[PDB]
């Protein structure tokens, strides 16, 4: 179904921000996360190795489609989680 | 005698950028309760002051948590976490161990932080429909220079006067109107500036 | 595609296109589709987009843009320009 | 919630009284010591004086230069604070402040514009800049009270405005000096409110 509307790459490589771009390069995974407050994980000795200062979720709105993105809709979102950390766009040094 | 509370003048801040403003203290403000007794006050140009931190180290509530403090017994630092475009203004170094508070401090120019450029020192000779009014204002104009920190000289001084914008936020530089009120005889008988944006002064003149 | 034999060459690409539209939005009562609704308050996205752009230029011969129906976001502007754009 | 709204603005010759009250809301009015700041254009502030808490009783304490001058009162009933000016001088003019504290400016009043001047209102004199060869610009000399708007184009330019701020004569009167820059034959016009003297301006070298 992700073929039928034409998203995806012939190849199964998401070619981000490359002038080959096909679009998704689906693959299957997963991934999971024990989170703890800092001073909660500090007190009990459990490990620290990396600390989430801030988060937030942003709905594209009123976009061009569903699956379609927001341009204005991920600078509040990445600006909300950047005012609720109280971080700033010249403090990350890298963004996945 | 006066405790003497200045604080250091030509602040130049950066949106994003952290900074820090300190104060002088003569006498010590470390009263004897263990509390600071000095404050920080924010005239935000346009509106009224606001009540930034008391105490040396306590923040007030409306404002945010931001603005952090503290100090030593003479020594004071305001620990401006972070400059937003709205953070804009003049800070003050108000104490508080000996009213009256009749001075509250000469201020600190708190500038949107950017690059030395050259000031557009442009001499303007007065129209002569006005020198056949009954008076004459030649204009030594600058533009798009900062810091503000030069006066215009009138050779070939005195009857000058002060004129100068804030910063505006595109372009974020000042610009300075030395208005030369004169007298109708004396028009027959140049101005530069000494701004750190050169280092010679530019000489032209009516 | 009709070659200019009427006045009618308009009416004609426009009820062609209404056809189209009715076949690519799921319409089984291809009878009716809101003429002055625009391309996307009838679900015309991505897909209902690029297949009716297909099928425009497949039964008309032509060759519309990638964003025709961001260009025409009416029924009524999209025959319109494709039945001013016979050469 | 809090709000310190003031009135009492106005126009006057040295030597005169005018009116300040301070509008208080939100809060027992008797407990803190309400105090007035007086702001100098465009520099620094100066505090002119307080009252103590009926509470606390205590008396009016002054600024040095507004002895046997200025007078401060409150009252709980009518919750007002009073700035009473009497033998105005020159310095006069500035913006004075109502403040929430004597030793403690918690909040802050918006201002109002008290102006000490000997000037009349009149229309400006509005003299341009001839360019040396570039910036074109044109004086607004001679003109009071002080709105003022000054635009270029007749608001139709707006990039590399400079509405220089007001000019102090020691006449009481004021000028500005709005000039553009921009390599070229401009409009600028300047509205006296008060006066109703529109003067529309050419200009070239």
């Known amino acids: 179904d992700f073929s039928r509307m034409n998203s995806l790459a012939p190849d199964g490589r998401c070619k981000a921000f490359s002038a080959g771009a096909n679009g998704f390069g689906m693959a299957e995974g997963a991934g999971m996360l024990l989170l703890e407050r800092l001073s909660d994980a500090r007190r009990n000795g459990h490990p620290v190795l990396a600390v989430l200062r801030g988060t937030a979720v942003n709905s594209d709105g009123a976009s061009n489609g569903l699956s379609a993105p927001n341009g204005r809709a991920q600078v509040r979102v990445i600006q909300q989680a950047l005012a609720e950390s109280g971080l700033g766009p010249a403090d990350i040094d890298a963004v996945e | 005698d006066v405790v003497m509370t200045q604080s250091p003048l030509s602040l130049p801040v950066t949106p994003g950028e952290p900074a820090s403003i300190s104060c002088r203290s003569s006498?010590?403000?470390?009263?004897?309760?263990?509390?600071?007794?000095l404050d920080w006050y924010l005239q935000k140009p346009g509106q009224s002051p606001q009540l930034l931190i008391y105490?040396?180290?306590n923040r007030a509530s409306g404002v945010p948590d931001r603005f952090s403090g503290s100090g030593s017994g003479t020594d004071f630092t305001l620990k401006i976490s972070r400059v937003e475009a709205e953070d804009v203004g003049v800070y003050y170094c108000?104490?508080?161990?000996?009213?009256?508070?009749?001075?509250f401090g000469p201020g600190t120019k708190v500038d949107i932080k950017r690059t030395v450029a050259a000031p557009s020192v442009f001499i303007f000779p007065p129209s002569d429909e006005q020198l056949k009014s009954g008076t004459a204002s030649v204009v030594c104009l600058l533009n798009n220079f900062y810091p503000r920190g030069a006066k215009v000289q009138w050779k070939v001084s005195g009857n000058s006067q002060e004129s100068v914008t804030e910063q505006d936020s595109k372009d974020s530089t000042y610009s300075l109107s030395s208005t030369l009120t004169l007298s109708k005889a004396d028009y027959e008988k140049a101005c530069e500036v000494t701004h750190q944006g050169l280092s010679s002064p530019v000489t032209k003149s009516f | 595609l009709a070659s200019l034999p009427a006045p009618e060459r308009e009416k004609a690409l426009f009820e062609l296109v209404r056809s189209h539209a009715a076949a690519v939005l799921g319409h089984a009562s291809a009878e009716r589709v809101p003429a002055d609704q625009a391309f996307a308050e009838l679900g015309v996205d991505s897909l209902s987009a690029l297949e009716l752009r297909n099928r425009l230029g497949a039964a008309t011969g032509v060759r519309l843009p990638t964003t025709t129906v961001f260009d025409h976001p009416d029924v009524r502007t999209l025959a319109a320009h494709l039945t001013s754009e016979l050469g | 919630e809090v709000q310190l709204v003031q009135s009492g603005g106005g126009l006057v010759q040295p030597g005169r009284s005018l009116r300040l009250s301070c509008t208080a809301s939100?809060?027992?009015?008797?407990?803190?010591?309400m105090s007035w700041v007086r702001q100098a254009p465009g520099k620094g502030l100066e505090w002119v004086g307080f009252?103590?808490?009926?509470?606390?009783?205590?008396?009016?304490e002054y600024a040095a230069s507004v002895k046997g001058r200025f007078t401060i009162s409150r009252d709980d009933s009518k919750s007002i604070a009073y700035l009473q000016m009497n033998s105005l001088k020159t310095e006069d003019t500035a913006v004075y402040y109502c403040?929430?504290?004597?030793?403690?400016?918690?909040?802050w009043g918006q201002g109002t514009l008290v102006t000490v001047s000997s000037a009349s209102t009149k229309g400006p004199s509005v003299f341009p800049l001839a360019p040396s060869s570039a910036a074109l610009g044109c004086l607004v000399k001679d003109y009071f009270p002080e709105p003022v708007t000054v635009s270029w184009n007749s608001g139709a330019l707006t990039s590399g405005v400079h509405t220089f701020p007001a000019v102090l004569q020691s006449s009481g009167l004021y000028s500005l000096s709005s000039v553009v820059t921009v390599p070229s034959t401009y409009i600028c016009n300047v509205n006296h409110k008060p006066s109703n003297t529109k003067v529309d301006k050419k200009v070239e070298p």
């Open positions: 403040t929430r504290g004597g030793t403690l400016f918690d909040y």
């Open positions: 939100g809060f027992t009015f008797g407990d803190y010591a």
């Open positions: 009252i103590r808490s009926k509470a606390y009783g205590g008396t009016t």
């Open positions: 006498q010590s403000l470390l009263h004897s309760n263990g509390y600071n007794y």
């Open positions: 105490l040396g180290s």
């Open positions: 108000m104490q508080s161990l000996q009213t009256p508070r009749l001075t």
